[PDB]
Design a protein around this ligand. Sequence first.
Ligand code: GTP
Ligand code: MG
Ligand code: MG
Lengths: 82, 75, 83, 885, 275
Amino acid sequence: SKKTHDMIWEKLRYILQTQELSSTLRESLETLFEIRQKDYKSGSQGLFILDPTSYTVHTHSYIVSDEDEANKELGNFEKCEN
Amino acid sequence: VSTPELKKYMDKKILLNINGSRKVAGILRGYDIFLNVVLDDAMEINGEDPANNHQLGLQTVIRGNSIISLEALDA
Amino acid sequence: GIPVKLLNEAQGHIVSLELTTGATYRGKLVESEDSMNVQLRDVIATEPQGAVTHMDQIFVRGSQIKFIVVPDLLKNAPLFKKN
Amino acid sequence: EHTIFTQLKKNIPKTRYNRDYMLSMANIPERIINVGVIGPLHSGKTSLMDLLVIDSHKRIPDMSKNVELGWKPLRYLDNLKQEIDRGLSIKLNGSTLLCTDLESKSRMINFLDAPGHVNFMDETAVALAASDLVLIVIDVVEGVTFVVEQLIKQSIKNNVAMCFVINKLDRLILDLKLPPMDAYLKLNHIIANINSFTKGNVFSPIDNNIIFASTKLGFTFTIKEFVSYYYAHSIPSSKIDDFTTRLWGSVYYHKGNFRTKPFENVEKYPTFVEFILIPLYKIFSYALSMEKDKLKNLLRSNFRVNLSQEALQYDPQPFLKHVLQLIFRQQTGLVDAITRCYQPFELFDNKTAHLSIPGKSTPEGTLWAHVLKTVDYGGAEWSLVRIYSGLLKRGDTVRILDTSQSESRQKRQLHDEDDETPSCEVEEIGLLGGRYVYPVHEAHKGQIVLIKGISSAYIKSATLYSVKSKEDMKQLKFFKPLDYITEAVFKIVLQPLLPRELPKLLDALNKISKYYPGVIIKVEESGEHVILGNGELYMDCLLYDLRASYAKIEIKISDPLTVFSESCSNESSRLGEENLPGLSISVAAEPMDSKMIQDLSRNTLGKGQNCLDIDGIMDNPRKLSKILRTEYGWDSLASRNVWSFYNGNVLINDTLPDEISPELLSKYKEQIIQGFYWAVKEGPLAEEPIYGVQYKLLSISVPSDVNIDVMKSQIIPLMKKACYVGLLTAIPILLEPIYEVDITVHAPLLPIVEELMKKRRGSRIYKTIKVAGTPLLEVRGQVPVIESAGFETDLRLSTNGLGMCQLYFWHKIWRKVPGDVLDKDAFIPKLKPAPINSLSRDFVMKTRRRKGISTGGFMSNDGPTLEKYISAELYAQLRENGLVP
Amino acid sequence: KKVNGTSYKKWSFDLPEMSNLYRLSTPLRDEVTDKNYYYLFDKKSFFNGKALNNAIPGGPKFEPLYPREEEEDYNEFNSIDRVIFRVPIRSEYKVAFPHLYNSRPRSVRIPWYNNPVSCIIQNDEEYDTPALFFDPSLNPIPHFGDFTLPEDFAPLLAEEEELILPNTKDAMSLYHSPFPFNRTKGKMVRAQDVALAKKWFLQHPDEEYPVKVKVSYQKLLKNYVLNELHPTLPTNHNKTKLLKSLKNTKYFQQTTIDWVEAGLQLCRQGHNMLN
RNA sequence: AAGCAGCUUUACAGAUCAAUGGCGGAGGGAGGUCAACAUCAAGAACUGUGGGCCUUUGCCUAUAGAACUUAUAACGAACAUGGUUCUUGCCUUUUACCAGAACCAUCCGGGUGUUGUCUCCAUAGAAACAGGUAAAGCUGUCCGUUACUGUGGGCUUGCCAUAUUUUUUGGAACUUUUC
Ligand SMILES: Nc1nc2c(ncn2[C@@H]2O[C@H](COP(=O)(O)OP(=O)(O)OP(=O)(O)O)[C@@H](O)[C@H]2O)c(=O)[nH]1
Ligand SMILES: [Mg+2]
Ligand SMILES: [Mg+2]
């Protein structure tokens, strides 16, 4: 999602240059810019066990503005007449 | 618009001729854009130096319109 | 205007100024302003009746001056050209 | 073969002015000003002179069709043939121009563009001494690098005004493609970075101290020039001075009124962006992309600018240059910045008091000039001179004192006669004009001219005076030797290929010592010739002129070497003795404090707005004992008995006969110090200078009977022998110079640079600056000068052109060579670099064989040992205790 | 409007036509925009490597310019007990500084020093990226009723609303482009004179190429150096060309025919000449 | 730059409808795989014109004009060959060769400047007259609008504040001696 992501950087880039920021937070923010030229080669390592056709592509399209049914109840004990 | 440049002179005893005949010599404190000049320990010079000379006041201000020329006696 | 600009050209140049009071101050020019009030150095002063004296430094209000004489060389000064 | 230069008088290019009105302005000292153009490497300095020359002149015969268009620069002030080939300024050059400011007041301005490469930092020290104000040209991409910082620090030191030129604004849009707000943050970052280094003065585009420029596209402007051209017509005339102050600096404009806070509901930029950068980037955008018929209407509507019918059929780079030269019409905003910055009432008395001794102003009857350097200007030997008083005509006779003599002549001027100074005739006077010399019959006060007939009387600088009466000679001031910033520390030993060509070499080396002022040419006792240089490029420029220009001979040349210094690590029956028993002088040694060494390298002793310079450091002995006791915590007795500060060293009288008879010592004191100068110049290890050794004169013996004739002549070789016994006993070491490195590389190519610093020996990266707005970053580190052979090209080949370093020796970092200097069992492998523990033994043994002090068959090691100076029976006593190996 | 006429000299194009030819030509263009790529690989360094008898690792090899080299003087000057050995003097050191790292250099030429480190941001992934854009790998920039002008006072070019035009991203690619794509006009050259493959061996090949084709890069560089080193200038008094002086004779006539027809005639005529 | 004034033109109604004055006009425009003749590598370099010195040359001084080519130096963003001489390479002799140099040439090409020619498109003339060069309104005579207004366009312009101390909304007025 390069196009919208680039827009996230551009607002993010507006943070550092044209606005005043707390110091310790600020050095971490520009480190992200540094990694960005460095291309992310230290955020890209992990356990890709599953092939891209062996993971059945259930890319769940859920938005953090959706009341999500908070189903704590199935972790309770119950009584299966099933 | 532009302020006259008296900047070096200030704090120096200066003689200046005002309007038709009068000559006034005094320490100079302030100047403005119209050349209005305020100087302290003013004295009105005349033909007889000690005699006809009379002091004016502790502080005197001069309209810039009556100034003909300014000469600073000093460094 | 060019006439005042020319006065800047005069600066550092022995110039002669005639007051409307009738006197004549010939000497070097320390400073000038758009107002035209001119302050000189080492001026040789000629009173209206001819008595000549010598003054270390001078300032004259612009309104007083009748005319100014400036270095003849200035005439071919770069600014003057019409085009 | 050497330069390109118009020799014919009739082919000298005419000017827009008539050039006699320019020389009429030389009569007024206040009218004329001297600006010298300094900056980093490739900063656009010579191109900034291209804009000032071709707008002064009407037709230059050296300018071609590619140069009249945008394609190739007229490096008009790079007239040397090597400068055309290197693409680089090497020599100082200049051109005297008549220039008008925004108030149309014409005045004679003497320009001098210094070379920006860091090995030619001797040439800009001439430009700092010549100029009234420096026009420091900064590229916007690299910004304020570490070579910019020193050019701000040197101009404060030389009591010289400064005015900053931000250059290369095309790279800010065409190379880097920054959005216009993102480039305003770039310009605001650099200006805030030059204001920290200018410790007093704030620099800002409102204050007319900062000029914006993109010199390849041939324009320059202040914000005062830009308002006075295109916005002064619209707004009332009482508002033009208040509008240009509301223009830079986070203040916003919308519909007639100004606010510091951003306007609500409106996408709005700062006033500098909206009124200058947005109009400028539209000129960049539309000259490249907008149709030439629609663009022609926008230039009449907004800029009142008519595009020619010939100009519409232009290639995109000459068309972009033609529009930016038809806007931004002249360099009247550059000259107005040069006019408004310089204040001769504040600076010219302090500038004279820095080049010579501080005193009262010399009278106008005295002719008094400063001879800056000897210039090989256009197939002749000229002298670059600046006049400070009087009037000089062609054919006069002047007294010309070499500046190396002016330390004693100024000291002998006090007197609590005749034959004092050689006399040469002023053969010819000219004005430097780039590719020509314009002859003039006389030269007034305050202007830089070129005089033929002076250069034989001096080496490397001079003072020129012509005094009328003998009483008037008492008050004249002599100039101090010129503070070339980098020390000549890069060493090359040469001899001619043929022995019969040696007088032609010695004739050419005397020319190079004049022409290249930052060299130290010396002759060793073996007959070889040592040239001390600033770098690899400074030697390659030197040895071109030595082989091609000044001597047609072929010469043998060694590898790059360095100068070593000698020191000690600790303090240390210590005595010295001559074969005659009449003289017995005991000297101890001790390392000086690191802060005491570091401040004497800065040429002044003190801390915290209280410092005493080395020239008058003897003249206040009460105040010197105050500085030594308070700041560094010495003893009260050691503060009172210090005799002399020679370069990096100190002598203290600590003896009981000084408590008995100091007057007997005082008649022999001046020649102990003369012998102390005779020992610091060539030390005991490898005939190398001594640096950072605290000498203490422990005792001195005076024979029965007194002879001024014999005692005077004997104590000077013995004190030099006695200083060797003190240093060799005190655990001696060897020092090496340390270049500081200023690397510019792209940000991905940094691990290449870090591995490249590990292949060298004593290299360390101390600071890594993200150069903001750019893909590249600044790397600051150090390297030893003996290791920095081909360092500059190892960096460039490994980064594929995206790397560059500047190697410089501003700070005088002398570092202990890692070995032990007295190692009889050190393993020196042939043809390979010796290991790190063998370094102090290797560098001394090879130096002692270049000098001829240690003579071996192939490799015989007689080390610097404490037995040829002391008695041999005492040397056997030193072996049994374990003190001496 | 694009050419002077059917004499076919001195063309001149507009910006969209010029960028369109630039885009078709990307298999055969130069594809290098900085002159710092050619640091020790320009022809000044190629002349020095011939004159100093050094070998640049991709450059050509020549005969010795001064083959009488084996003479020597027995002297204490360059002996091993004299020389400090710190850094091996490479052949790249001898060519970058010909007067410093060479005892007795002659017929060497002064090389160009650096150019400023080129930081040109190009954008090739997306056409919808604007022409002026804060690209990644750029370092960020971290920092930080009184007076009234009459209304409708505007900055310069305020009536023109857009900064980036639809041809600006194309034109800035052409501005930093090598010859002839940075031009929009120029004279005609011959079909002989358009060296499409010259820019391939003026560059470093890559490490991936085999050894039989890296020799072909070196051997074509060697012919490039010898043409630059030895110019044969044309004399001006040659006013009699062959086709022009035969046109003046009554024994030659002129027409236009096909090329393949004129080739078949010259084969028939040239067979009739030799037979 | 809207607007007013000044200026320059303009469709013009004019004044004059004379002597005038200004600009334009007194044998085109675009071209051609057309031609001829000059010219194209040198103190960073050219030529015309006036003045002075020496006795034409040369120098000095003043002025006008400089197309093309050239600075990481060359008409060509390109690139072959030949001759001689020196030094090598191959190794029966020669030719043809090997591959570096130095000095010279030939060949394929290019620019610019005039003039002639050729092709296509042309028509207001007042393009009327008289002189002459290597060139032409080159000059004289001349004709078109016309030199002084108002409307309509453009700007080499006003400084957008026009009465309250440095300029243009008045410190002015009156009387007296000498000669
Ligand atoms: N993009 C861009 N390049 C420039 C500009 N000015 C100069 N350059 C280039 O940068 C190089 C350096 O310019 P120079 O004229 O040699 O400036 P310099 O500072 O005198 O260089 P030095 O000789 O080392 O002192 C030149 O080759 C120019 O082509 C500029 O304004 N913009
Ligand atoms: Mg330069
Ligand atoms: Mg035979």
